[PDB]
């Protein structure tokens, strides 16, 4: 089954993303973006509706990190050191997993600064569900 997780963004960031999540201990990387890994760098080093990257030069690389519960189901979101932090419901959050739910705002980053590019990632958790 594929558990899913809908992200609207609330502040004009970044469009709509609908994101498989991977079973623990696998999961799924939240931040910015002639080889054997061309056609999976390729896509992976995109901003696309199907995976965790975010044009915003606030975030870091490795940022948060989404996993998902096989016994439960359950959606979770931790930070991964980021310099800017991550922030659920507005509570800044750390390396520990916290849940997250239908309802709930994820924000990536502070930002000193509102201008293209520069603004903080804000994500409305609109759904959750399986295939």
Same mark, same amino acid.
């Given at each position: ?26 999961? #799924? ?10 056609? !999976? @760098? =390729?896509? /992976? ?5 199907? &995976? ?13 990190? #989404? ?10 979101? !931790? @930070? =991964?050191? /980021? ?5 659920? &419901? ?42």
């Amino acid at each position: 089954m594929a558990h899913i997780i809908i992200l609207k963004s609330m502040n004009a960031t970044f469009e709509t993303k609908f994101l498989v999540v991977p079973f623990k201990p696998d999961g #799924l990387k939240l931040g910015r973006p002639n080889n054997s890994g061309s056609k !999976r @760098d =390729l896509f /992976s080093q995109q901003v696309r509706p199907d &995976n965790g990257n975010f044009d915003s030069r606030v975030l870091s690389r490795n940022h948060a990190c #989404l996993s998902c519960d096989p016994t439960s189901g359950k959606i979770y979101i !931790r @930070d =991964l050191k /980021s310099s800017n932090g991550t922030f659920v &419901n507005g509570v800044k959050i750390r390396q520990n997993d916290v849940e997250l739910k239908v309802g709930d705002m994820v924000d990536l980053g502070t930002d000193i600064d509102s201008k293209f590019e520069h603004r903080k990632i804000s994500a409305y958790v609109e759904e959750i569900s399986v295939i």
